[PDB]
Short mmCIF file of C-alpha atoms and ligand atoms in Angstrom, two decimals:
data_model
loop_
_atom_site.label_atom_id
_atom_site.label_comp_id
_atom_site.label_asym_id
_atom_site.label_seq_id
_atom_site.Cartn_x
_atom_site.Cartn_y
_atom_site.Cartn_z
CA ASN A 26 -63.45 2.54 119.50
CA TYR A 27 -60.80 2.88 122.02
CA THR A 28 -57.50 2.06 120.32
CA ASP A 29 -55.12 2.80 122.97
CA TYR A 30 -54.35 1.61 126.57
CA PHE A 31 -55.63 4.31 129.12
CA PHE A 32 -52.72 4.16 131.57
CA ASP A 33 -49.54 6.09 131.60
CA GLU A 34 -47.27 4.69 129.17
CA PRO A 35 -44.09 5.82 130.88
CA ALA A 36 -45.24 3.85 134.12
CA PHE A 37 -45.88 0.60 132.38
CA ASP A 38 -44.32 -2.48 133.82
CA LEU A 39 -42.33 -2.98 130.66
CA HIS A 40 -40.21 0.12 131.95
CA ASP A 41 -39.60 -1.73 135.29
CA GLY A 42 -35.99 -2.49 136.58
CA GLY A 43 -35.44 -6.08 135.78
CA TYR A 44 -38.49 -6.26 133.44
CA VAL A 45 -39.26 -9.90 132.55
CA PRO A 46 -40.56 -10.06 128.99
CA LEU A 47 -42.93 -12.76 128.15
CA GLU A 48 -41.53 -15.61 125.96
CA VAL A 49 -43.58 -17.95 123.71
CA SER A 50 -43.15 -21.51 125.30
CA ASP A 51 -42.24 -24.32 122.77
CA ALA A 52 -44.82 -26.54 124.58
CA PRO A 53 -47.34 -28.08 122.22
CA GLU A 54 -50.48 -25.93 121.82
CA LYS A 55 -53.46 -27.67 123.41
CA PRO A 56 -57.05 -26.68 124.20
CA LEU A 57 -57.72 -24.02 126.78
CA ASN A 58 -58.75 -25.65 130.21
CA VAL A 59 -62.02 -24.18 131.29
CA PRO A 60 -62.53 -25.08 134.97
CA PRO A 61 -65.64 -27.10 135.63
CA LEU A 62 -68.39 -25.68 137.74
CA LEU A 63 -68.12 -26.51 141.15
CA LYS A 64 -71.24 -28.90 142.02
CA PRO A 65 -73.11 -27.56 145.16
CA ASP A 66 -73.66 -30.21 148.15
CA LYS A 67 -77.10 -29.10 147.74
CA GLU A 68 -79.17 -26.33 146.29
CA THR A 69 -82.72 -24.76 146.50
CA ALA A 70 -84.04 -21.60 145.08
CA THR A 71 -83.38 -19.95 148.60
CA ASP A 72 -80.23 -21.78 149.89
CA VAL A 73 -77.02 -23.10 148.50
CA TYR A 74 -74.36 -25.51 150.02
CA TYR A 75 -70.73 -25.70 148.87
CA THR A 76 -67.63 -27.42 150.03
CA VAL A 77 -64.48 -25.68 149.00
CA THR A 78 -61.34 -27.74 149.61
CA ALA A 79 -57.83 -26.38 149.33
CA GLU A 80 -55.60 -29.35 148.27
CA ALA A 81 -52.02 -30.06 146.93
CA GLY A 82 -51.54 -32.08 143.78
CA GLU A 83 -49.69 -32.28 140.38
CA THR A 84 -50.67 -30.64 136.99
CA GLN A 85 -49.35 -31.44 133.46
CA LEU A 86 -48.39 -27.98 132.40
CA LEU A 87 -45.27 -28.68 130.41
CA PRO A 88 -43.96 -31.80 128.42
CA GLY A 89 -42.07 -33.96 131.08
CA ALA A 90 -42.66 -33.85 134.91
CA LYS A 91 -46.00 -32.76 136.38
CA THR A 92 -45.64 -29.36 138.09
CA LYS A 93 -46.52 -29.63 141.91
CA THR A 94 -49.45 -27.24 142.43
CA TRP A 95 -52.25 -26.11 144.81
CA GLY A 96 -56.02 -25.73 144.06
CA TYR A 97 -59.55 -25.55 145.13
CA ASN A 98 -61.34 -28.97 144.45
CA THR A 99 -58.76 -29.76 141.88
CA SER A 100 -54.92 -29.63 141.36
CA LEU A 101 -54.45 -26.02 140.14
CA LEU A 102 -56.45 -22.98 140.43
CA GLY A 103 -60.05 -24.00 141.19
CA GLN A 104 -63.64 -25.21 139.89
CA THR A 105 -65.74 -22.01 139.19
CA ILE A 106 -68.07 -21.14 142.08
CA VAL A 107 -71.57 -19.74 141.26
CA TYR A 108 -73.31 -17.39 143.68
CA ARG A 109 -76.63 -15.76 143.36
CA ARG A 110 -77.83 -12.54 144.64
CA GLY A 111 -80.42 -12.96 147.57
CA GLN A 112 -79.52 -16.75 147.96
CA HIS A 113 -78.47 -17.75 151.45
CA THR A 114 -74.90 -19.23 150.81
CA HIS A 115 -73.31 -21.98 153.03
CA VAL A 116 -69.72 -22.83 152.59
CA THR A 117 -67.59 -25.36 154.21
CA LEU A 118 -63.83 -24.19 154.02
CA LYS A 119 -61.76 -27.45 154.13
CA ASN A 120 -57.89 -27.03 154.37
CA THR A 121 -55.91 -30.22 153.27
CA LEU A 122 -52.76 -28.44 152.58
CA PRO A 123 -49.69 -28.97 154.66
CA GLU A 124 -50.02 -25.23 155.79
CA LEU A 125 -52.43 -22.69 156.96
CA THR A 126 -54.39 -20.52 154.50
CA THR A 127 -57.25 -18.30 154.29
CA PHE A 128 -60.30 -18.11 151.77
CA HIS A 129 -60.70 -14.56 150.54
CA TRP A 130 -63.74 -13.76 148.45
CA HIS A 131 -62.34 -10.80 146.51
CA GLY A 132 -64.95 -8.17 145.79
CA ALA A 133 -67.77 -9.94 147.72
CA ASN A 134 -69.62 -7.74 150.04
CA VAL A 135 -69.48 -9.84 153.04
CA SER A 136 -68.76 -9.18 156.83
CA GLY A 137 -65.10 -9.03 158.12
CA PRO A 138 -62.90 -10.13 159.12
CA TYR A 139 -63.71 -13.88 159.16
CA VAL A 140 -66.20 -14.43 156.37
CA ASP A 141 -64.26 -11.84 154.29
CA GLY A 142 -61.43 -14.60 154.80
CA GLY A 143 -58.51 -11.93 154.91
CA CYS A 144 -55.41 -11.64 157.21
CA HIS A 145 -57.58 -12.60 160.25
CA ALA A 146 -59.25 -15.88 159.03
CA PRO A 147 -56.75 -18.57 159.28
CA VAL A 148 -57.84 -22.33 158.36
CA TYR A 149 -55.21 -24.53 159.77
CA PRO A 150 -54.19 -28.00 158.11
CA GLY A 151 -56.77 -30.59 158.52
CA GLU A 152 -59.40 -28.12 159.61
CA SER A 153 -62.90 -27.12 158.34
CA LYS A 154 -64.68 -23.87 158.98
CA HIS A 155 -68.17 -22.94 158.13
CA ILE A 156 -69.45 -19.60 156.89
CA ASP A 157 -72.76 -18.33 155.56
CA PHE A 158 -73.79 -15.06 153.79
CA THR A 159 -76.15 -13.48 151.40
CA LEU A 160 -74.76 -11.38 148.48
CA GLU A 161 -76.68 -8.10 148.03
CA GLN A 162 -74.69 -6.87 145.12
CA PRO A 163 -74.93 -6.94 141.07
CA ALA A 164 -74.15 -9.71 138.72
CA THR A 165 -70.35 -9.74 138.11
CA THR A 166 -67.16 -11.73 138.03
CA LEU A 167 -65.41 -12.09 141.45
CA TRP A 168 -62.62 -14.48 142.44
CA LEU A 169 -61.27 -16.61 145.35
CA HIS A 170 -57.77 -16.72 146.44
CA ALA A 171 -55.70 -17.35 149.44
CA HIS A 172 -54.99 -14.29 151.75
CA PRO A 173 -52.63 -15.32 154.61
CA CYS A 174 -50.71 -12.11 155.80
CA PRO A 175 -48.16 -13.34 154.71
CA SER A 176 -47.61 -14.81 152.18
CA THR A 177 -50.66 -14.20 149.75
CA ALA A 178 -48.03 -13.94 146.91
CA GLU A 179 -46.70 -17.47 147.61
CA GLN A 180 -50.17 -19.12 147.99
CA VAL A 181 -51.26 -17.55 144.78
CA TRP A 182 -48.17 -18.62 143.14
CA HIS A 183 -48.70 -22.29 144.10
CA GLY A 184 -52.09 -21.95 142.37
CA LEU A 185 -54.69 -20.83 144.83
CA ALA A 186 -57.25 -18.76 142.76
CA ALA A 187 -60.64 -19.41 141.31
CA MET A 188 -63.23 -17.56 139.53
CA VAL A 189 -66.57 -16.81 141.22
CA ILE A 190 -69.39 -15.92 139.07
CA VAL A 191 -72.20 -13.82 140.47
CA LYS A 192 -75.72 -14.19 139.03
CA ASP A 193 -78.59 -12.03 139.47
CA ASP A 194 -82.06 -11.41 137.71
CA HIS A 195 -81.28 -8.29 135.75
CA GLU A 196 -78.23 -9.79 133.95
CA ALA A 197 -80.29 -12.95 133.18
CA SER A 198 -82.62 -10.85 131.14
CA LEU A 199 -80.06 -9.48 128.87
CA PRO A 200 -78.72 -10.76 125.44
CA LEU A 201 -75.35 -11.90 126.43
CA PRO A 202 -73.52 -15.28 125.90
CA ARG A 203 -74.04 -17.47 129.15
CA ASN A 204 -73.38 -21.05 128.15
CA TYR A 205 -70.59 -21.66 130.58
CA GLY A 206 -67.69 -23.12 128.79
CA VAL A 207 -69.18 -22.85 125.19
CA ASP A 208 -69.72 -19.14 124.66
CA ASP A 209 -68.82 -17.89 127.95
CA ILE A 210 -65.45 -18.76 129.48
CA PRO A 211 -62.90 -17.49 132.02
CA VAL A 212 -59.69 -16.09 130.83
CA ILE A 213 -57.48 -16.02 134.06
CA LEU A 214 -54.28 -14.40 133.08
CA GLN A 215 -51.15 -15.28 134.92
CA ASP A 216 -47.48 -16.06 134.28
CA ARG A 217 -44.96 -18.52 135.89
CA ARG A 218 -41.29 -19.41 135.78
CA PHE A 219 -40.65 -23.07 135.22
CA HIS A 220 -37.40 -24.60 136.86
CA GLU A 221 -35.77 -27.99 136.58
CA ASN A 222 -38.38 -30.95 136.22
CA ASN A 223 -41.00 -28.26 135.41
CA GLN A 224 -41.23 -27.22 139.06
CA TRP A 225 -42.16 -23.71 140.60
CA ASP A 226 -39.87 -21.96 142.91
CA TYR A 227 -41.27 -18.80 144.22
CA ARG A 228 -38.17 -18.21 146.64
CA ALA A 229 -35.73 -18.61 143.80
CA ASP A 230 -37.91 -16.09 141.61
CA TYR A 231 -38.77 -13.78 144.55
CA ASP A 232 -38.61 -10.10 144.10
CA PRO A 233 -39.98 -7.60 146.62
CA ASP A 234 -40.92 -5.43 143.71
CA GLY A 235 -43.13 -7.99 142.17
CA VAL A 236 -42.62 -11.42 140.69
CA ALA A 237 -43.16 -12.24 137.14
CA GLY A 238 -42.14 -15.24 135.07
CA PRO A 239 -41.63 -15.46 131.39
CA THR A 240 -44.38 -18.08 130.65
CA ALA A 241 -47.99 -16.89 130.38
CA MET A 242 -50.40 -19.48 131.79
CA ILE A 243 -54.33 -19.18 130.90
CA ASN A 244 -56.65 -21.01 133.16
CA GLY A 245 -53.60 -23.36 134.05
CA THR A 246 -52.86 -23.89 130.43
CA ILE A 247 -49.54 -23.42 128.42
CA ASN A 248 -49.91 -22.20 124.72
CA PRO A 249 -54.03 -22.69 124.78
CA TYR A 250 -56.44 -22.50 121.99
CA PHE A 251 -60.16 -22.06 122.21
CA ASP A 252 -62.59 -23.70 119.76
CA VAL A 253 -65.11 -21.00 118.80
CA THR A 254 -68.74 -22.65 117.92
CA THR A 255 -70.76 -19.40 118.19
CA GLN A 256 -70.61 -16.13 116.40
CA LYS A 257 -70.19 -14.17 119.75
CA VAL A 258 -68.03 -15.12 122.84
CA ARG A 259 -67.99 -13.73 126.40
CA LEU A 260 -64.44 -13.61 127.78
CA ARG A 261 -64.25 -13.09 131.57
CA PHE A 262 -60.79 -11.54 131.78
CA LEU A 263 -59.08 -11.73 135.20
CA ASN A 264 -55.57 -10.21 135.90
CA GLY A 265 -54.49 -13.27 138.40
CA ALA A 266 -50.71 -12.44 137.99
CA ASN A 267 -48.60 -11.52 140.96
CA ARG A 268 -47.52 -8.12 139.21
CA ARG A 269 -47.65 -8.18 135.26
CA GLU A 270 -50.09 -5.96 133.32
CA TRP A 271 -52.05 -7.20 130.35
CA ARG A 272 -52.10 -5.04 127.42
CA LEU A 273 -54.85 -7.07 125.38
CA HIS A 274 -55.57 -6.85 121.50
CA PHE A 275 -56.04 -9.17 118.84
CA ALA A 276 -54.68 -9.67 115.23
CA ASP A 277 -56.29 -7.83 112.70
CA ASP A 278 -57.39 -5.40 115.51
CA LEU A 279 -60.47 -7.35 116.08
CA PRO A 280 -62.75 -5.05 118.20
CA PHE A 281 -64.39 -6.22 121.35
CA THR A 282 -66.92 -4.76 123.71
CA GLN A 283 -66.61 -4.54 127.39
CA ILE A 284 -69.92 -5.16 129.21
CA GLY A 285 -68.52 -5.83 132.80
CA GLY A 286 -66.04 -4.44 135.24
CA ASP A 287 -65.00 -5.77 138.63
CA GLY A 288 -68.32 -5.37 140.64
CA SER A 289 -71.08 -4.76 137.82
CA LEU A 290 -72.08 -4.48 134.37
CA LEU A 291 -70.83 -1.16 132.87
CA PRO A 292 -73.74 1.40 132.56
CA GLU A 293 -72.99 1.19 128.68
CA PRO A 294 -71.15 -1.19 126.61
CA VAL A 295 -67.68 0.13 125.65
CA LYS A 296 -65.72 -0.80 122.47
CA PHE A 297 -61.99 -1.26 122.21
CA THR A 298 -59.15 -2.65 120.11
CA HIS A 299 -56.81 -2.44 122.90
CA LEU A 300 -57.43 -2.89 126.74
CA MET A 301 -54.97 -2.91 129.57
CA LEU A 302 -55.89 -4.53 133.14
CA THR A 303 -53.59 -4.18 136.29
CA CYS A 304 -53.48 -6.90 138.92
CA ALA A 305 -56.93 -8.27 140.33
CA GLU A 306 -59.16 -6.21 137.81
CA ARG A 307 -61.63 -7.94 135.79
CA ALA A 308 -63.12 -7.04 132.35
CA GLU A 309 -66.02 -9.09 130.78
CA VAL A 310 -65.93 -8.59 126.92
CA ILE A 311 -68.12 -9.79 124.03
CA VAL A 312 -65.93 -10.79 120.98
CA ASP A 313 -67.85 -10.98 117.67
CA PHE A 314 -66.06 -13.38 114.99
CA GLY A 315 -68.76 -12.97 112.35
CA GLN A 316 -66.07 -11.64 109.97
CA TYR A 317 -63.99 -14.96 109.99
CA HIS A 318 -64.75 -18.03 107.78
CA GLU A 319 -64.61 -21.48 109.27
CA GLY A 320 -61.06 -22.87 109.40
CA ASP A 321 -59.54 -19.49 110.07
CA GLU A 322 -57.84 -18.45 113.47
CA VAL A 323 -57.33 -15.27 115.35
CA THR A 324 -54.89 -14.74 118.03
CA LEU A 325 -55.25 -12.73 121.26
CA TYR A 326 -51.82 -10.90 122.32
CA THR A 327 -50.57 -8.97 125.30
CA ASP A 328 -48.12 -6.57 123.77
CA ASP A 329 -46.15 -8.40 120.99
CA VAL A 330 -46.58 -11.79 122.60
CA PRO A 331 -49.43 -14.22 121.39
CA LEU A 332 -51.49 -15.59 124.33
CA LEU A 333 -54.47 -17.41 123.02
CA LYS A 334 -55.69 -18.62 119.70
CA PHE A 335 -59.32 -18.80 118.71
CA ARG A 336 -59.90 -21.49 116.07
CA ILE A 337 -63.17 -20.45 113.97
CA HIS A 338 -65.66 -23.41 113.66
CA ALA A 339 -68.96 -23.36 111.80
CA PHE A 340 -71.43 -21.12 113.99
CA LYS A 341 -75.08 -19.96 113.50
CA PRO A 342 -75.32 -16.15 112.51
CA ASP A 343 -76.18 -14.10 115.59
CA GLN A 344 -78.70 -11.46 114.93
CA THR A 345 -78.71 -9.92 118.51
CA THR A 346 -77.18 -6.66 119.50
CA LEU A 347 -76.40 -5.04 122.83
CA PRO A 348 -78.68 -2.57 124.28
CA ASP A 349 -77.66 1.13 124.54
CA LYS A 350 -77.69 0.69 128.49
CA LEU A 351 -76.82 -2.48 130.24
CA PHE A 352 -77.12 -1.29 133.88
CA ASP A 353 -78.24 1.62 136.10
CA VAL A 354 -75.78 3.01 138.48
CA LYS A 355 -77.40 4.25 141.55
CA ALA A 356 -74.62 6.41 143.49
CA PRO A 357 -75.12 6.53 147.31
CA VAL A 358 -75.38 9.90 148.85
CA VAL A 359 -72.37 11.56 150.53
CA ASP A 360 -72.92 13.30 154.10
CA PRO A 361 -71.21 16.84 153.56
CA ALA A 362 -70.04 16.74 157.08
CA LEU A 363 -67.74 13.79 156.37
CA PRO A 364 -63.96 14.57 155.53
CA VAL A 365 -62.40 13.53 152.36
CA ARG A 366 -60.16 10.70 153.31
CA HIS A 367 -56.85 10.94 151.76
CA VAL A 368 -54.67 7.61 151.33
CA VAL A 369 -51.25 7.86 150.01
CA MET A 370 -49.42 4.87 148.50
CA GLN A 371 -45.66 5.42 148.62
CA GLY A 372 -42.38 3.65 147.62
CA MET A 373 -41.67 0.62 145.68
CA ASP A 374 -39.51 -2.70 146.40
CA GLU A 375 -38.95 -3.17 150.06
CA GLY A 376 -39.97 0.36 150.96
CA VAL A 377 -43.52 0.21 150.05
CA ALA A 378 -45.86 1.71 152.56
CA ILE A 379 -49.36 3.28 152.99
CA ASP A 380 -49.73 6.81 154.57
CA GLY A 381 -45.93 6.33 155.76
CA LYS A 382 -46.26 2.96 157.19
CA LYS A 383 -46.11 -0.98 156.61
CA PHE A 384 -49.05 -3.02 157.63
CA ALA A 385 -49.12 -4.36 161.07
CA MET A 386 -51.66 -7.07 161.66
CA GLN A 387 -53.00 -5.68 165.03
CA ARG A 388 -52.93 -2.06 164.23
CA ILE A 389 -56.12 -0.38 163.02
CA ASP A 390 -55.20 2.43 160.54
CA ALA A 391 -58.84 3.85 159.80
CA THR A 392 -62.44 3.75 160.94
CA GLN A 393 -65.43 4.59 159.00
CA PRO A 394 -69.31 4.15 159.96
CA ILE A 395 -71.28 1.48 157.99
CA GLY A 396 -74.02 2.66 155.65
CA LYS A 397 -72.16 6.11 154.93
CA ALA A 398 -70.34 6.76 151.57
CA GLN A 399 -67.38 8.90 151.78
CA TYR A 400 -65.06 10.26 149.24
CA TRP A 401 -61.63 8.74 149.26
CA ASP A 402 -58.77 10.34 147.41
CA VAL A 403 -56.20 7.79 146.58
CA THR A 404 -52.62 9.13 145.61
CA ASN A 405 -49.93 7.27 144.02
CA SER A 406 -46.71 9.16 145.33
CA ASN A 407 -44.27 7.76 142.85
CA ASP A 408 -42.69 10.33 140.88
CA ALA A 409 -42.16 9.61 137.18
CA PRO A 410 -41.31 7.08 135.78
CA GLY A 411 -42.77 4.90 138.58
CA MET A 412 -45.27 2.01 138.58
CA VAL A 413 -49.20 1.87 138.29
CA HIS A 414 -50.27 0.54 141.76
CA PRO A 415 -53.64 -1.22 141.71
CA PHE A 416 -55.41 0.01 144.74
CA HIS A 417 -57.94 -2.49 146.33
CA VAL A 418 -60.35 -2.20 149.20
CA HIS A 419 -62.00 -5.20 151.02
CA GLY A 420 -65.62 -5.39 151.87
CA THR A 421 -66.99 -2.81 149.31
CA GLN A 422 -67.69 -1.91 145.71
CA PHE A 423 -66.76 1.61 145.10
CA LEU A 424 -67.47 4.05 142.22
CA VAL A 425 -64.83 6.04 140.42
CA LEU A 426 -65.43 9.58 140.14
CA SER A 427 -62.46 11.36 138.89
CA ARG A 428 -58.67 10.96 137.92
CA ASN A 429 -56.67 14.43 138.78
CA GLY A 430 -60.19 16.11 138.91
CA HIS A 431 -60.92 14.64 135.26
CA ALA A 432 -63.22 11.83 134.10
CA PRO A 433 -62.22 8.20 135.07
CA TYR A 434 -61.34 5.91 132.28
CA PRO A 435 -64.32 5.09 129.84
CA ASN A 436 -64.54 1.50 131.33
CA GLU A 437 -64.67 2.85 135.02
CA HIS A 438 -68.16 4.18 135.28
CA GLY A 439 -69.51 0.84 136.92
CA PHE A 440 -68.89 -0.83 140.29
CA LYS A 441 -65.09 -1.50 140.96
CA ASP A 442 -62.90 -2.91 143.90
CA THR A 443 -59.45 -2.52 142.27
CA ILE A 444 -58.16 0.71 140.42
CA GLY A 445 -54.95 1.53 138.80
CA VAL A 446 -53.39 4.60 140.12
CA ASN A 447 -50.63 6.28 137.98
CA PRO A 448 -47.63 7.95 139.50
CA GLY A 449 -48.41 11.55 140.67
CA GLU A 450 -52.30 10.82 140.21
CA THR A 451 -55.00 11.27 142.72
CA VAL A 452 -58.27 9.22 142.03
CA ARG A 453 -61.36 10.06 143.85
CA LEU A 454 -63.56 7.19 144.85
CA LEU A 455 -66.99 6.79 146.54
CA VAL A 456 -66.84 4.19 149.11
CA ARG A 457 -69.43 2.89 151.37
CA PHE A 458 -69.27 -0.21 153.67
CA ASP A 459 -72.54 -2.09 154.22
CA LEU A 460 -71.36 -4.17 157.09
CA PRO A 461 -69.27 -3.74 160.32
CA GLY A 462 -65.89 -5.44 160.53
CA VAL A 463 -62.13 -5.05 159.82
CA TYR A 464 -61.17 -4.77 156.33
CA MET A 465 -57.81 -4.58 154.50
CA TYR A 466 -57.05 -2.04 151.67
CA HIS A 467 -53.74 -2.35 149.74
CA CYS A 468 -52.07 -2.75 146.44
CA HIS A 469 -52.74 -5.86 144.61
CA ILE A 470 -49.21 -6.27 143.15
CA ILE A 471 -49.00 -9.19 145.50
CA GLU A 472 -45.43 -8.79 146.59
CA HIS A 473 -46.33 -5.12 147.43
CA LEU A 474 -49.20 -6.70 149.43
CA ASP A 475 -46.98 -9.07 151.36
CA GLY A 476 -44.01 -6.39 151.55
CA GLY A 477 -46.34 -4.08 153.66
CA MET A 478 -48.50 -1.90 151.05
CA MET A 479 -51.50 -2.62 153.18
CA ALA A 480 -53.66 -1.02 156.09
CA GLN A 481 -56.86 -2.11 157.58
CA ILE A 482 -60.04 -0.14 158.49
CA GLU A 483 -62.56 -0.95 161.06
CA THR A 484 -66.13 -0.12 160.06
CA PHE A 485 -68.71 0.06 162.75
CA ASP A 486 -72.36 0.65 163.62
CA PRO A 487 -72.65 4.06 165.34
CA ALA A 488 -75.58 2.84 167.43
CA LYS A 489 -73.58 0.13 169.00
CA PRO A 490 -70.24 0.28 171.02
CA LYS A 491 -66.96 -0.53 169.61
CA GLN A 492 -66.90 -4.33 168.96
CA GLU A 493 -63.79 -6.38 169.85
CA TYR A 494 -62.36 -8.59 167.12
CA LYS A 495 -59.75 -11.30 167.65
CA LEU A 496 -57.02 -10.25 165.12
CA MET A 497 -54.09 -12.53 164.01
CA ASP A 498 -50.69 -11.70 165.49
CA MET A 499 -47.43 -12.37 163.63
CA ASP A 500 -46.00 -14.51 166.37
CA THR A 501 -49.10 -16.89 166.26
CA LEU A 502 -48.66 -17.10 162.52
CA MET A 503 -44.92 -17.88 162.58
CA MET A 504 -45.48 -20.53 165.46
CA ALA A 505 -48.12 -22.19 163.27
CA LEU A 506 -45.90 -22.16 160.21
CA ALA A 507 -42.74 -23.56 162.11
CA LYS A 508 -44.80 -26.47 163.52
CA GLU A 509 -46.15 -27.13 160.10
CA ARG A 510 -42.68 -27.00 158.42
CA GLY A 511 -40.77 -28.98 161.17
CA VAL A 512 -38.46 -26.12 161.71
CA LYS A 513 -37.89 -23.24 164.35
CA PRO A 514 -39.59 -19.78 163.97
CA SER A 515 -36.16 -18.16 163.23
CA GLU A 516 -35.48 -20.24 160.16
CA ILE A 517 -38.97 -19.65 158.43
CA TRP A 518 -38.99 -17.98 154.95
CA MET A 519 -42.11 -16.03 153.98
CA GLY A 520 -42.51 -13.74 151.06
CA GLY A 521 -42.52 -10.09 152.16
CA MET A 522 -40.48 -10.89 155.24
CA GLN A 523 -37.43 -9.48 153.40
CA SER A 524 -39.19 -6.11 152.76
CA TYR A 525 -39.87 -5.78 156.63
CA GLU A 526 -36.44 -7.02 157.73
CA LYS A 527 -34.63 -4.77 155.27
CA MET A 528 -36.51 -1.82 156.57
CA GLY A 529 -35.99 -2.79 160.18
CA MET A 530 -39.50 -3.33 160.91
CA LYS A 531 -41.94 -6.23 161.65
CA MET A 532 -45.75 -7.25 161.00
AG1 AG B 1 -40.71 -0.42 141.04
AG1 AG B 2 -48.04 -11.09 159.62
CU1 CU B 3 -57.60 -10.19 145.69
CU1 CU B 4 -59.90 -8.52 148.26
CU1 CU B 5 -47.89 -1.39 144.60
CU1 CU B 6 -56.59 -8.18 150.19
#
């Protein structure tokens, strides 16, 4: 039973300069929103068709005025999208927002830079784009979010994020809760700051070192409760915050068992009383409420702040038990002739950088052949006290081999796409790209992302000549935004610009 957070306590966000503590809202407690499942336009055993529509609207979050929000196929966040390993997936990306966006499938092993939906995949106002892909990767929880470069931070803040569930045959065979919305629920962890008339104001809250508001928002709900009607419940934790770290535990120190990470089931279940998640990380846990009587309640906390109340209703006894082993991890081979790649994250605030530079949308920072796993050493250069930087790579699911030459954390033996790197620490990852393209790698503190803590790698088939890709440029991006907002390029405000400008550089 893991009873403490794994990360280095001195580097926790709560020691940040200008740390924003969470405060319990006075808003009335209400049922946790569970995003509906997006209904396919059509579906067979072999093909599924979806239309995913970015849209602007309004959402009742606090008593009083509705908060203006953005969402996918709804006003805030999104309907949950289900993908299936081996199923040919066809998606119409529709943008009905007043500004351009991008549709990034975080953790999905798809081609880049277009299907990947990163910096180079704009979808302009009024436009529809079509993509198709077949996922060949294990069952897991992924997510969809906006990824214009910039500002990913602003678009996520507005509400553009949705859970993506990947199903496969192996997971389906297992005794896990799986009744979506009944005993299997998203827990998208975010925070916001509400201004006058219950509005969000990213610009007013902007901080190049990471934006955090004092009001926790879970699945777009303030002060939620969940009605438990089964002994066991599956929680799909997703850290969807711009910066905040979640340090999760129950009252009574009720234990819970992690069965999944970002990219796969864990090889074996891992039991915990206290679990920490950095930005973009996912943890699927099973909670067993068998020791509670009907009518009782149990609250989930982050640090000393209540997040989510579980109300215990009558439930049937559950006699099932987790197998000793959930999933077999097959590590790809590493060609000994390959170098160990060294990636160095540095800086904070406006001076964030990777390998001595801020992102430049037309600069390739690295290449790697497809189909060849390589060791990546990833270092967080910050001296103590520092912050934990969650490092993320597009177009892959990696394995974690070591932290400072020692074992990874107990819940890091499955496939992952995002890893918290502590000040002074070097983590060794095993990284392979199955598909050619251009893929970002960056910190997932989203203000750091926007502020230039990002690079891109061109993965290539060595049997073919170098491919040419149409990369977005910053002049094109700013022209578009200018037209869209009815202003001149020079008066455009974007999250991340301040970091570039203050360091005298440009994207
Ligand atoms: Ag900092
Ligand atoms: Ag740019
Ligand atoms: Cu992401
Ligand atoms: Cu990503
Ligand atoms: Cu960072
Ligand atoms: Cu990214």
